[PDB]
Nucleic acid binder design. Structure first.
Ligand SMILES: [Mg+2]
Ligand SMILES: [Mg+2]
Ligand SMILES: [Mg+2]
Ligand SMILES: [Mg+2]
Ligand SMILES: [Mg+2]
Ligand SMILES: [Mg+2]
Ligand SMILES: [Mg+2]
Ligand SMILES: [Mg+2]
Ligand SMILES: [Mg+2]
Ligand SMILES: [Mg+2]
Ligand SMILES: [Mg+2]
Ligand SMILES: [Mg+2]
Ligand SMILES: [Mg+2]
Ligand SMILES: [Mg+2]
Ligand SMILES: [Mg+2]
Ligand SMILES: [Mg+2]
Ligand SMILES: [Mg+2]
Ligand SMILES: [Mg+2]
Ligand SMILES: [Mg+2]
Ligand SMILES: [Mg+2]
Ligand SMILES: [Mg+2]
Ligand SMILES: [Mg+2]
Ligand SMILES: [Mg+2]
Ligand SMILES: [Mg+2]
Ligand SMILES: [Mg+2]
Ligand SMILES: [Mg+2]
Ligand SMILES: [Mg+2]
Ligand SMILES: [Mg+2]
Ligand SMILES: [Mg+2]
Ligand SMILES: [Mg+2]
Ligand SMILES: [Mg+2]
Ligand SMILES: [Mg+2]
Ligand SMILES: [Mg+2]
Ligand SMILES: [Mg+2]
Ligand SMILES: [Mg+2]
Ligand SMILES: [Mg+2]
Ligand SMILES: [Mg+2]
Ligand SMILES: [Mg+2]
Ligand SMILES: [Mg+2]
Ligand SMILES: [Mg+2]
Ligand SMILES: [Mg+2]
Ligand SMILES: [Mg+2]
Ligand SMILES: [Mg+2]
Ligand SMILES: [Mg+2]
Ligand SMILES: [Mg+2]
Ligand SMILES: [Mg+2]
Ligand SMILES: [Mg+2]
Ligand SMILES: [Mg+2]
Ligand SMILES: [Mg+2]
Ligand SMILES: [Mg+2]
Ligand SMILES: [Mg+2]
Ligand SMILES: [Mg+2]
Ligand SMILES: [Mg+2]
Ligand SMILES: [Mg+2]
Ligand SMILES: [Mg+2]
Ligand SMILES: [Mg+2]
Ligand SMILES: [Mg+2]
Ligand SMILES: [Mg+2]
Ligand SMILES: [Mg+2]
Ligand SMILES: [Mg+2]
Ligand SMILES: [Mg+2]
Ligand SMILES: [Mg+2]
Ligand SMILES: [Mg+2]
Ligand SMILES: [Mg+2]
Ligand SMILES: [Mg+2]
Ligand SMILES: [Mg+2]
Ligand SMILES: [Mg+2]
Ligand SMILES: [Mg+2]
Ligand SMILES: [Mg+2]
Ligand SMILES: [Mg+2]
Ligand SMILES: [Mg+2]
Ligand SMILES: [Mg+2]
Ligand SMILES: [Mg+2]
Ligand SMILES: [Mg+2]
Ligand SMILES: [Mg+2]
Ligand SMILES: [Mg+2]
Ligand SMILES: [Mg+2]
Ligand SMILES: [Mg+2]
Ligand SMILES: [Mg+2]
Ligand SMILES: [Mg+2]
Ligand SMILES: [Mg+2]
Ligand SMILES: [Mg+2]
Ligand SMILES: [Mg+2]
Ligand SMILES: [Mg+2]
Ligand SMILES: [Mg+2]
Ligand SMILES: [Mg+2]
Ligand SMILES: [Mg+2]
Ligand SMILES: [Mg+2]
Ligand SMILES: [Mg+2]
Ligand SMILES: [Mg+2]
Ligand SMILES: [Mg+2]
Ligand SMILES: [Mg+2]
Ligand SMILES: [Mg+2]
Ligand SMILES: [Mg+2]
Ligand SMILES: [Mg+2]
Ligand SMILES: [Mg+2]
Ligand SMILES: [Mg+2]
Ligand SMILES: [Mg+2]
Ligand SMILES: [Mg+2]
Ligand SMILES: [Mg+2]
Ligand SMILES: [Mg+2]
Ligand SMILES: [Mg+2]
Ligand SMILES: [Mg+2]
Ligand SMILES: [Mg+2]
Ligand SMILES: [Mg+2]
Ligand SMILES: [Mg+2]
Ligand SMILES: [Mg+2]
Ligand SMILES: [Mg+2]
Ligand SMILES: [Mg+2]
Ligand SMILES: [Mg+2]
Ligand SMILES: [Mg+2]
Ligand SMILES: [Mg+2]
Ligand SMILES: [Mg+2]
Ligand SMILES: [Mg+2]
Ligand SMILES: [Mg+2]
Ligand SMILES: [Mg+2]
Ligand SMILES: [Mg+2]
Ligand SMILES: [Mg+2]
Ligand SMILES: [Mg+2]
Ligand SMILES: [Mg+2]
Ligand SMILES: [Mg+2]
Ligand SMILES: [Mg+2]
Ligand SMILES: [Mg+2]
Ligand SMILES: [Mg+2]
Ligand SMILES: [Mg+2]
Ligand SMILES: [Mg+2]
Ligand SMILES: [Mg+2]
Ligand SMILES: [Mg+2]
Ligand SMILES: [Mg+2]
Ligand SMILES: [Mg+2]
Ligand SMILES: [Mg+2]
Ligand SMILES: [Mg+2]
Ligand SMILES: [Mg+2]
Ligand SMILES: [Mg+2]
Ligand SMILES: [Mg+2]
Ligand SMILES: [Mg+2]
Ligand SMILES: [Mg+2]
Ligand SMILES: [Mg+2]
Ligand SMILES: [Mg+2]
Ligand SMILES: [Mg+2]
Ligand SMILES: [Mg+2]
Ligand SMILES: [Mg+2]
Ligand SMILES: [Mg+2]
Ligand SMILES: [Mg+2]
Ligand SMILES: [Mg+2]
Ligand SMILES: [Mg+2]
Ligand SMILES: [Mg+2]
Ligand SMILES: [Mg+2]
Ligand SMILES: [Mg+2]
Ligand SMILES: [Mg+2]
Ligand SMILES: [Mg+2]
Ligand SMILES: [Mg+2]
Ligand SMILES: [Mg+2]
Ligand SMILES: [Mg+2]
Ligand SMILES: [Mg+2]
Ligand SMILES: [Mg+2]
Ligand SMILES: [Mg+2]
Ligand SMILES: [Mg+2]
Ligand SMILES: [Mg+2]
Ligand SMILES: [Mg+2]
Ligand SMILES: [Mg+2]
Ligand SMILES: [Mg+2]
Ligand SMILES: [Mg+2]
Ligand SMILES: [Mg+2]
Ligand SMILES: [Mg+2]
Ligand SMILES: [Mg+2]
Ligand SMILES: [Mg+2]
Ligand SMILES: [Mg+2]
Ligand SMILES: [Mg+2]
Ligand SMILES: [Mg+2]
Ligand SMILES: [Mg+2]
Ligand SMILES: [Mg+2]
Ligand SMILES: [Mg+2]
Ligand SMILES: [Mg+2]
Ligand SMILES: [Mg+2]
Ligand SMILES: [Mg+2]
Ligand SMILES: [Mg+2]
Ligand SMILES: [Mg+2]
Ligand SMILES: [Mg+2]
Ligand SMILES: [Mg+2]
Ligand SMILES: [Mg+2]
Ligand SMILES: [Mg+2]
Ligand SMILES: [Mg+2]
Ligand SMILES: [Mg+2]
Ligand SMILES: [Mg+2]
Ligand SMILES: [Mg+2]
Ligand SMILES: [Mg+2]
Ligand SMILES: [Mg+2]
Ligand SMILES: [Mg+2]
Ligand SMILES: [Mg+2]
Ligand SMILES: [Mg+2]
Ligand SMILES: [Mg+2]
Ligand SMILES: [Mg+2]
Ligand SMILES: [Mg+2]
Ligand SMILES: [Mg+2]
Ligand SMILES: [Mg+2]
Ligand SMILES: [Mg+2]
Ligand SMILES: [Mg+2]
Ligand SMILES: [Mg+2]
Ligand SMILES: [Mg+2]
Ligand SMILES: [Mg+2]
Ligand SMILES: [Mg+2]
Ligand SMILES: [Mg+2]
Ligand SMILES: [Mg+2]
Ligand SMILES: [Mg+2]
Ligand SMILES: [Mg+2]
Ligand SMILES: [Mg+2]
Ligand SMILES: [Mg+2]
Ligand SMILES: [Mg+2]
Ligand SMILES: [Mg+2]
Ligand SMILES: [Mg+2]
Ligand SMILES: [Mg+2]
Ligand SMILES: [Mg+2]
Ligand SMILES: [Mg+2]
Ligand SMILES: [Mg+2]
Ligand SMILES: [Mg+2]
Ligand SMILES: [Mg+2]
Ligand SMILES: [Mg+2]
Ligand SMILES: [Mg+2]
Ligand SMILES: [Mg+2]
Ligand SMILES: [Mg+2]
Ligand SMILES: [Mg+2]
Ligand SMILES: [Mg+2]
Ligand SMILES: [Mg+2]
Ligand SMILES: [Mg+2]
Ligand SMILES: [Mg+2]
Ligand SMILES: [Mg+2]
Ligand SMILES: [Zn+2]
Lengths: 48, 116, 112, 59, 118
RNA sequence: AGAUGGUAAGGGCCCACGGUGGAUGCCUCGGCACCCGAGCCGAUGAAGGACGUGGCUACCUGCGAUAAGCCAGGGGG
RNA sequence: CGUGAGGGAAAGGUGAAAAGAACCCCGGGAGGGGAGUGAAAUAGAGCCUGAAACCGUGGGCUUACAAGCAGUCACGGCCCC
RNA sequence: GCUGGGGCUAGGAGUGAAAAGCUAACCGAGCCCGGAGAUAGCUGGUUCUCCCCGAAAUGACUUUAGGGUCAGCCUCAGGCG
RNA sequence: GUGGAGCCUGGGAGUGAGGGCGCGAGCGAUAACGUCCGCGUCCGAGCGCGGGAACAACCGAGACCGCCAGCUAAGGCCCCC
RNA sequence: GGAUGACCCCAGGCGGUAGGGGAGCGUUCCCGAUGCCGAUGAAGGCCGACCCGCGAGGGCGGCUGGAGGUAAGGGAAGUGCGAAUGCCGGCAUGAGUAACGAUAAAGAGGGUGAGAAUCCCUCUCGCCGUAAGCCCAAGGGUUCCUACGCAAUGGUCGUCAG
């Protein structure tokens, strides 16, 4: 049946994207947190 | 300092397993099953160390009885006679006499019969 | 004098090859050869090679005569298992063990 | 059903007892009267190709 | 049970089984000798023998009969003109089956050859 | 009429020797704690990255189309 | 692994020195057997030591009229010292 | 009426032709990280050896009754005799 | 009456679901392997030993270790024994 | 008794759960250590029917191992495992068993190759045909086309292959 992951590039970037994270106090904390952890990707990989 | 298990436990398990040599299946191969077996074994030894003294006395009595009825009396009568005669050779030797030295055993039967 | 061959890491399961090996233990090199040729098993292929190479070893390295060689000892040992995932129903995953054999054939000479 | 299951692990003795019938029977072979090679009976000899006295097959 | 029943099933339904013998017949009659598994081999004999017997008759009818299974006019011409005469005097047994000595690697199937006779 | 042995398809205990596995001991390019030292960076565009960069170059490191490096001072041999 | 925030592993050791096994042999290869190296190669790279469960090969004793938490006590047979 | 694409509304909040349905495969209150090692009068588990002594399952009170406080009963040290 | 008696001061407890049996009652039906008190006992913790076919608490008896020695207890002495 | 813990003699106690008390064993580490044991072989491992200890253990011997270990007497703790549907890993049992993923379907000949039911070619047969064919968009990201391969991936095989 129709499962839950229904990939969409625009949807993806607009929701978890770097600019999306920056617009918001929480998302900037997300970016802060992931950078302090040493994550190689602060943001979900995406292609355009 | 940190004191890890290290060498100690393996050595204790080896101790037990070596004692469990000869045992069936995991009883000789697995520490846990071995240990359980060995407890049983230990109590059996103790208990049987005891019954060995019983197991033999019963045998001697059966043997002495047989040799008595050859001379026309039973064990009970025989022993009473010996008691009356003051003969204190025990049943270990009484039996050995009853088999190896039947003449001497015969004489003891005489003494027993006379003491009644 | 003896000659040995070993095939390490054969991608078959020991319990299976051993069946084939059991057929040829103690046989003359000539009978063993015939046996293996008409044994209907995958294992027969692997065993034959180890046997054939050991025969080679005896002739070529150990001054033993082909017409006297016999399977003195033979045995299969378990090698490291290749673990694979087998997807089952209801989201469960099993683990297949694709197993491994170390096959040994040892030849001696039947004298006289 | 209610999903039956082994109640106890089978012992080394008992699993091997089960396998007391598992040994392979060696292939039954006879000499080919033409080339004396060993082959299963009632099959065309895969070495010289002869059966019933004549050449039948290109080996 | 199976008491006194004649005919292998060869793990095929009715139409596949029929097709199987026909294609075998086309190949036997074509190449003179094919290799199959022993069971198909033994079962192929009579199916082909009958077809050869009809060729031994020669009439238009028997030709149209064989065509129902063999389906190829050229193959049948070969059957009637070259094959059938070889058997003018032979009373049945137009085919033989001899078993090979080695099995298939991939599934262990025992093999046999089936050929037209001299 | 009497009695007593060799059977092992396979199993069991023991001994040897292997396979598998990776405990134990030893080892440490790593960590931990205290102590001391030291302590901001950024529109002269930071932190952190992306993509590039080698004669042959996957990754890491270095570096930035002057790209495992350019100039000068000092050290060193 | 999770859409995401986020979760989050496993994985060290040849040898003093690569001297990391030329060459020959079986094999499609993997693998092995000689030759060679090394104080050592069951230190051969799937590499220090290499326990245990677990699997196998060989040998000794034993088992197909017998009742079991598998032991223990006694005696006897066989094998070894 | 159904369906693609682009959007908006969410955790005591959304959305609901209403079933406490659904809100990323368990929703009478999502998920992650944090408070956090919550609390658990409950269940389980608690690892070498020898030697000496050796209980209780009663009384009183208790939002107490399978938990407690004191007393009874065990043990050790010193004192008395 | 010198006892792992007793008393005094302290340190550490554990126990505060008992149970069978005998005797005396209540409750029950002069029912229950029932319930609830009293005196005692044993099991608990002596599922260690002997007897009772077998069986925590019935009878016998309180197992420091060893003995191929003797006497008894309850219970037994026709065979299993 | 002798001098006070030397050892001897005589006597009595010595079942034990919760629990109290006493005495010891062993593990990591520190002083003892600028020492001593050690390649004439450290630790660790494997045997032992030998010795000491009531016991926990300690020796000694042989084999392994190849570079460490540390006494008498003291000091300090991450100090002893069989159970926690414990944790991590390894390996068993079930078992050569169930299964190998639509019942549209196969057969032969000829190639190739160490090896072929499974790769290529041919012929025969069967299945889809508002599809099981064709073309877009999402999404996936080199999977495309050749050459050379078959350890692993492929539910078998493999010379073939996303
Ligand atoms: Mg739909
Ligand atoms: Mg998913
Ligand atoms: Mg959609
Ligand atoms: Mg899009
Ligand atoms: Mg969108
Ligand atoms: Mg965005
Ligand atoms: Mg701000
Ligand atoms: Mg955000
Ligand atoms: Mg990165
Ligand atoms: Mg993000
Ligand atoms: Mg990005
Ligand atoms: Mg420890
Ligand atoms: Mg520990
Ligand atoms: Mg053992
Ligand atoms: Mg035994
Ligand atoms: Mg057992
Ligand atoms: Mg015991
Ligand atoms: Mg005794
Ligand atoms: Mg005695
Ligand atoms: Mg007695
Ligand atoms: Mg008397
Ligand atoms: Mg007397
Ligand atoms: Mg005599
Ligand atoms: Mg096989
Ligand atoms: Mg076997
Ligand atoms: Mg064959
Ligand atoms: Mg066969
Ligand atoms: Mg040769
Ligand atoms: Mg499935
Ligand atoms: Mg699924
Ligand atoms: Mg499993
Ligand atoms: Mg498995
Ligand atoms: Mg394996
Ligand atoms: Mg059903
Ligand atoms: Mg089982
Ligand atoms: Mg088991
Ligand atoms: Mg079992
Ligand atoms: Mg079984
Ligand atoms: Mg076995
Ligand atoms: Mg069985
Ligand atoms: Mg012939
Ligand atoms: Mg039928
Ligand atoms: Mg018939
Ligand atoms: Mg039939
Ligand atoms: Mg028939
Ligand atoms: Mg038919
Ligand atoms: Mg048939
Ligand atoms: Mg079928
Ligand atoms: Mg069928
Ligand atoms: Mg079938
Ligand atoms: Mg079919
Ligand atoms: Mg039809
Ligand atoms: Mg041809
Ligand atoms: Mg007919
Ligand atoms: Mg028809
Ligand atoms: Mg037709
Ligand atoms: Mg055949
Ligand atoms: Mg055959
Ligand atoms: Mg196959
Ligand atoms: Mg007779
Ligand atoms: Mg025998
Ligand atoms: Mg036997
Ligand atoms: Mg046998
Ligand atoms: Mg070994
Ligand atoms: Mg290893
Ligand atoms: Mg150390
Ligand atoms: Mg450091
Ligand atoms: Mg400014
Ligand atoms: Mg930067
Ligand atoms: Mg780079
Ligand atoms: Mg300079
Ligand atoms: Mg994912
Ligand atoms: Mg995903
Ligand atoms: Mg992801
Ligand atoms: Mg390692
Ligand atoms: Mg080194
Ligand atoms: Mg090194
Ligand atoms: Mg060759
Ligand atoms: Mg070659
Ligand atoms: Mg090839
Ligand atoms: Mg090689
Ligand atoms: Mg080699
Ligand atoms: Mg040398
Ligand atoms: Mg040398
Ligand atoms: Mg030396
Ligand atoms: Mg060497
Ligand atoms: Mg070698
Ligand atoms: Mg070694
Ligand atoms: Mg080594
Ligand atoms: Mg080293
Ligand atoms: Mg090793
Ligand atoms: Mg190894
Ligand atoms: Mg081992
Ligand atoms: Mg054996
Ligand atoms: Mg009978
Ligand atoms: Mg018998
Ligand atoms: Mg029996
Ligand atoms: Mg039975
Ligand atoms: Mg029993
Ligand atoms: Mg017995
Ligand atoms: Mg006796
Ligand atoms: Mg719309
Ligand atoms: Mg829409
Ligand atoms: Mg929409
Ligand atoms: Mg949308
Ligand atoms: Mg909420
Ligand atoms: Mg909230
Ligand atoms: Mg609301
Ligand atoms: Mg609606
Ligand atoms: Mg979710
Ligand atoms: Mg849901
Ligand atoms: Mg709630
Ligand atoms: Mg949800
Ligand atoms: Mg947080
Ligand atoms: Mg708090
Ligand atoms: Mg928390
Ligand atoms: Mg908690
Ligand atoms: Mg609370
Ligand atoms: Mg006491
Ligand atoms: Mg109470
Ligand atoms: Mg009370
Ligand atoms: Mg209550
Ligand atoms: Mg409570
Ligand atoms: Mg209290
Ligand atoms: Mg108190
Ligand atoms: Mg008192
Ligand atoms: Mg006192
Ligand atoms: Mg006193
Ligand atoms: Mg007094
Ligand atoms: Mg007392
Ligand atoms: Mg007292
Ligand atoms: Mg007091
Ligand atoms: Mg007190
Ligand atoms: Mg205390
Ligand atoms: Mg309590
Ligand atoms: Mg209470
Ligand atoms: Mg109660
Ligand atoms: Mg009550
Ligand atoms: Mg009461
Ligand atoms: Mg009560
Ligand atoms: Mg009481
Ligand atoms: Mg009464
Ligand atoms: Mg009375
Ligand atoms: Mg009354
Ligand atoms: Mg009652
Ligand atoms: Mg009553
Ligand atoms: Mg009553
Ligand atoms: Mg009650
Ligand atoms: Mg009372
Ligand atoms: Mg009472
Ligand atoms: Mg209790
Ligand atoms: Mg008691
Ligand atoms: Mg008592
Ligand atoms: Mg009792
Ligand atoms: Mg009982
Ligand atoms: Mg008893
Ligand atoms: Mg009793
Ligand atoms: Mg009794
Ligand atoms: Mg009772
Ligand atoms: Mg006593
Ligand atoms: Mg006493
Ligand atoms: Mg008496
Ligand atoms: Mg009496
Ligand atoms: Mg009487
Ligand atoms: Mg009697
Ligand atoms: Mg009786
Ligand atoms: Mg005494
Ligand atoms: Mg005492
Ligand atoms: Mg005691
Ligand atoms: Mg004390
Ligand atoms: Mg220790
Ligand atoms: Mg040590
Ligand atoms: Mg020295
Ligand atoms: Mg040495
Ligand atoms: Mg040495
Ligand atoms: Mg150490
Ligand atoms: Mg000892
Ligand atoms: Mg020792
Ligand atoms: Mg030693
Ligand atoms: Mg050593
Ligand atoms: Mg050093
Ligand atoms: Mg040491
Ligand atoms: Mg000091
Ligand atoms: Mg010390
Ligand atoms: Mg501590
Ligand atoms: Mg601890
Ligand atoms: Mg425990
Ligand atoms: Mg465990
Ligand atoms: Mg379970
Ligand atoms: Mg747990
Ligand atoms: Mg596990
Ligand atoms: Mg298994
Ligand atoms: Mg079968
Ligand atoms: Mg079954
Ligand atoms: Mg079946
Ligand atoms: Mg099946
Ligand atoms: Mg399928
Ligand atoms: Mg499946
Ligand atoms: Mg299928
Ligand atoms: Mg089918
Ligand atoms: Mg159809
Ligand atoms: Mg089929
Ligand atoms: Mg061909
Ligand atoms: Mg060729
Ligand atoms: Mg093929
Ligand atoms: Mg093939
Ligand atoms: Mg073909
Ligand atoms: Mg295929
Ligand atoms: Mg197929
Ligand atoms: Mg054709
Ligand atoms: Mg249709
Ligand atoms: Mg149409
Ligand atoms: Mg249609
Ligand atoms: Mg297309
Ligand atoms: Mg695209
Ligand atoms: Mg993908
Ligand atoms: Mg790729
Ligand atoms: Mg080209
Ligand atoms: Mg492959
Ligand atoms: Mg392959
Ligand atoms: Mg292959
Ligand atoms: Mg390759
Ligand atoms: Mg495959
Ligand atoms: Mg598959
Ligand atoms: Mg090839
Ligand atoms: Mg190709
Ligand atoms: Mg392609
Ligand atoms: Zn021939």
């Amino acid at each position: 049946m129709k499962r839950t992951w229904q990939p969409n590039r625009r949807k993806r970037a607009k929701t978890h994207g770097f600019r999306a994270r920056m617009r918001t106090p929480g998302g900037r904390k997300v970016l802060k947190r992931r950078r302090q952890k040493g994550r190689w990707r602060l943001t979900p990989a995406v292609r355009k | 300092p940190r004191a890890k298990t290290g060498v100690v436990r393996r050595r204790k398990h080896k101790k037990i397993l070596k004692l469990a040599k000869g045992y069936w299946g995991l009883r000789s191969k697995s520490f846990r099953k071995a240990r359980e077996t060995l407890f049983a074994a230990g109590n059996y030894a103790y208990a049987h160390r005891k019954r060995r003294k019983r197991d033999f006395r019963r045998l001697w009595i059966v043997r002495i009885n047989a040799a008595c009825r050859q001379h026309g009396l039973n064990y009970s009568t025989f022993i009473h006679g010996l008691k009356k005669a003051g003969i204190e050779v025990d049943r270990k030797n009484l039996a050995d006499l009853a088999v190896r030295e039947p003449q001497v055993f015969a004489e003891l039967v005489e003494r027993a019969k006379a003491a009644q | 004098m003896e000659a040995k061959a070993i095939a390490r890491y054969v991608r078959i399961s020991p319990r299976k090859v051993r069946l084939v090996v059991d057929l040829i233990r103690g046989k003359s090199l000539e009978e063993a050869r015939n046996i293996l040729r008409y044994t209907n098993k995958r294992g027969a292929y692997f065993v034959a090679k180890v046997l054939e190479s050991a025969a080679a070893n005896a002739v070529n390295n150990h001054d033993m005569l082909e017409d006297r060689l016999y399977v003195k000892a033979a045995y299969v040992d378990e090698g490291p298992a290749l673990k694979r995932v087998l997807p089952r129903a209801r989201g469960r995953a099993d683990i297949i063990k694709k197993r491994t054999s170390h096959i040994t054939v040892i030849l001696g000479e039947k004298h006289g | 059903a209610k999903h039956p299951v082994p109640k106890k692990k089978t012992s080394k003795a008992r699993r091997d007892a089960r396998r007391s019938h598992h040994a392979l029977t060696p292939p039954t072979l006879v000499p080919c009267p033409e080339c004396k090679a060993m082959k299963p009976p009632h099959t065309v000899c895969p070495e010289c190709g002869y059966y019933a006295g004549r050449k039948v097959l290109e080996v | 049970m199976r008491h006194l029943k004649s005919g292998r099933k060869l793990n095929r339904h009715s139409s596949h089984r029929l097709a199987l013998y026909r294609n075998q017949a086309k190949s036997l009659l074509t190449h003179g000798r094919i290799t199959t598994t022993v069971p198909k081999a033994k079962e192929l004999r009579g199916f082909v023998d009958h077809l050869i017997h009809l060729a031994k008759r020669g009439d238009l009818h028997a030709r149209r009969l064989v065509l129902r299974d063999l389906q190829d006019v050229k193959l049948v011409r070969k059957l009637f003109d070259e094959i059938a005469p070889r058997y003018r005097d032979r009373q049945g047994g137009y085919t033989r089956v001899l078993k090979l000595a080695e099995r298939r690697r991939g599934d262990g199937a025992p093999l046999a050859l089936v050929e037209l006779v001299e």
